[PDB]
Design a protein around this ligand. Structure first.
Ligand SMILES: CC(C)(COP(=O)(O)OP(=O)(O)OC[C@H]1O[C@@H](n2cnc3c(N)ncnc32)[C@H](O)[C@@H]1OP(=O)(O)O)[C@@H](O)C(=O)NCCC(=O)NCCSCC(=O)NCCc1c[nH]c2ccccc12
Length: 166
């Protein structure tokens, strides 16, 4: 009977298509590649949906974060496709906001809600991610500290690894 004006919930594999569509415009149209392809989105939403969060407006996904657990201090090429159940780090594989909903605090609201959501899970002691140099200041606003160049390479893109103690 009703499509909520705003809904925040963990994602399930049924949201994979919506997530990938956002990635097409958000990442692929810019650099030619993206953090998670359809199969990879489904992988993490199957293994660890509790490590994801999505913002729905009138029944449509407008922002998401997909993560998994990592168990090493630094991110590695292999960590891109792995979920370490025994790990203590919430690895945010991707964060994006639908192009028609940016610049209005949605990314910041979703990120803070995410940090509190996963930080609330006794097992998660830290959050890690990588971003392009221009987003470093942004993440620092949430308690993330620049942790040097990330070892992970994607095409010609280089990233700074960011760590947040929870
Ligand atoms: C960034 C985000 C989520 C903010 O949302 P919003 O617009 O709703 O945000 P707010 O309104 O809450 O705040 C906006 C703030 O963010 C700043 N900002 C936004 N875009 C900026 C930019 N390009 N450069 C500098 N500052 C910027 C604004 O300047 C502004 O600050 P000020 O107004 O105070 O200066 C939203 O713009 C978005 O979804 N963008 C596209 C996807 C993306 O990059 N995800 C983050 C990748 S970083 C995490 C990640 O996913 N890593 C994977 C790394 C990765 C793996 N494989 C790949 C393949 C290709 C590419 C990347 C990868």
């Amino acid at each position: 009977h009703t499509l909520p004006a705003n809904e925040f919930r963990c994602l399930t594999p049924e949201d994979a298509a919506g997530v990938f569509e956002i990635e097409r415009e958000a990442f692929i149209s810019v650099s030619g590649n993206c953090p998670l392809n359809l199969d990879e989105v489904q992988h993490f939403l199957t293994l660890c949906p509790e490590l994801s969060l999505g913002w729905f407006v009138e029944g449509r996904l407008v922002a998401f974060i997909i993560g998994s657990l990592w168990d090493e201090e630094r991110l590695t090429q292999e960590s891109l496709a792995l979920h370490r159940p025994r790990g203590h780090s919430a690895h945010l594989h991707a964060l994006a906001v639908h192009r028609s909903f940016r610049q209005q605090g949605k990314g910041s609201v979703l990120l803070w809600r995410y940090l509190h959501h996963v930080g609330a899970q006794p097992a998660v002691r830290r959050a890690v991610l990588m971003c392009e140099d221009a987003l470093v200041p942004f993440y620092q606003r949430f308690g993330f500290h620049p942790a040097g160049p990330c070892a992970i390479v994607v095409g010609s893109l280089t990233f700074t690894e960011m760590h947040c103690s929870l």
